[PDB]
Structure formats: C-alpha cells, structure tokens
C-alpha cells in the first residue's frame, strides 16, 4: 500500500517542493507520480521511479529506494497547482497514495 | 458511459471506448471519490480474461472486454453508498508502472 506525507504543500512560484511516498513492502522501484489538476483527470509524469514522462518538463524529477520515493519539482510554477499522487506498480494491486495537494503562495 | 444515479443494491454497466490504439496491454477501472481520494476498482487482461479486484469490490464487479469492438466494461452489481464516485479507465503501456489516463470520467452515484 502508500503513504503520502504532506498533505497540504503551501509554496511560492520559484520554490522547490518535495513530496514523498513509502510502501508496506519492497518494491524495486515501481513507482509512479500523477498530477490531476483541477477540474480534470489525472496525468502521468514520471514511471519507473524516475522516467519522466512523454512532455513533461525537466523540473519534475523522482527518486526512491526501497520504500520511500520523492516528487521532486525545481521551480515551482503556476501550472503545477493541483493534487499529486503516487502509485505503486510493483504487483498487484496497484493501490495510489492519498494525494497532497499543492497550492501557490501568493501576496 | 453508463454512469447516473442508482439506489443502493442496483446495478450498472460502465463502458469505455478507446481509439488512438487498437489495444492496450492492461486496462484497469480506477475511481475517484467526491473527496478526491482515487481507488483502484480492478484490472482485466482482454483476450483470456483474466481479472482481479481488491476485497472492495471482490465478487460484485465484473471487469470485462471486448478486443474486436475496442471496449473495456464493467458491471457493477449490488452497488453500495460507498461506490459513489467518479470512474476512469487507463491503460498500462508494457513497461509501464501504473495506469496511464485517457478517460474523462463518468459519475456514478448510489444513493
């Protein structure tokens, strides 16, 4: 299964922002990370730990070992708001974190 | 398709049309709740049917496909208050982790 710590992630455009997961048990590094922006579905952004998906840009990076992996974002921008969440693929089922949500700080 | 409200021990069959690819290795119903929380509903290997579901839904879902006409199914059965939610499907490209969008949804509510 997955957890997913922080829930909430207040961050200013330019920050850098780390969201993480860990698993019951070990598994290799079948992991995944969605972004589901609002008022849409979910989208892939990184597989395979840290394979970054088809279009996505560079400042999504993933990394983990054993249980623990993190979402890792450079410089936050303003279409990065939404909810995150992890998924791991390591047999079945594929169960997902329960998700943090990123919010920009702003004046 | 095939969402809508249902009262508590109805049933109802989900569709999900899929074009851009003529088949997908693994398509899976996965949902989300009205408090964002997602779910994984199950997952179906068309062409020998093989399937598998978590407890959640074990023995009252029914995922099914269909290789020729390009439709993934599911037929839920003795809906619970609980199954609310909104229904995707996604496919699992081959070494692919988890399961990649391409629904728009369908909202199911029981009540």
């Known amino acids: 299964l997955m957890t997913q710590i922080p829930a909430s992630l207040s961050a200013s455009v330019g920050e850098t922002v780390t969201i993480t997961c860990r698993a019951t048990?070990?598994?290799?590094?079948?992991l995944a990370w969605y972004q589901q922006k609002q008022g849409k579905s979910p989208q892939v952004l990184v597989h395979?730990?840290?394979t970054l998906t088809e279009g996505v840009p560079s400042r999504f990076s993933g990394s983990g070992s054993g249980t623990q992996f993190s979402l890792k974002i450079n410089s936050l921008q303003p279409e990065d708001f939404g909810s995150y969440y992890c998924?791991?693929?390591?047999?079945?089922?594929?169960?997902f974190g329960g998700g943090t949500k990123l919010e920009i700080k702003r004046a | 398709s095939g969402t809508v409200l249902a009262r508590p021990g109805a049933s109802v069959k989900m569709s999900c049309k899929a074009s851009?690819?003529?088949?997908?290795?693994?398509m899976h119903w996965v949902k989300q709740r009205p408090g964002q929380g997602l779910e994984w509903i199950g997952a179906?290997?068309?062409?020998?049917?093989?399937?598998d579901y978590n407890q959640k839904f074990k023995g009252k879902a029914k995922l099914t496909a269909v290789t020729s006409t390009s439709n993934e199914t599911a037929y839920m059965d003795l809906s619970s208050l609980t199954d609310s939610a909104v229904y995707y499907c996604?496919?699992?490209?081959?070494?692919?982790?988890?399961?990649?969008?391409w629904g728009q949804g369908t909202l199911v509510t029981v009540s």
């Open positions: 851009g690819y003529t088949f997908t290795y693994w």
């Open positions: 996604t496919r699992k490209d081959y070494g692919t982790e988890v399961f990649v969008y």
């Open positions: 395979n730990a840290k």
């Open positions: 179906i290997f068309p062409g020998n049917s093989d399937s």
């Open positions: 998924q791991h693929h390591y047999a079945t089922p594929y169960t």
């Open positions: 048990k070990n598994i290799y590094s079948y």
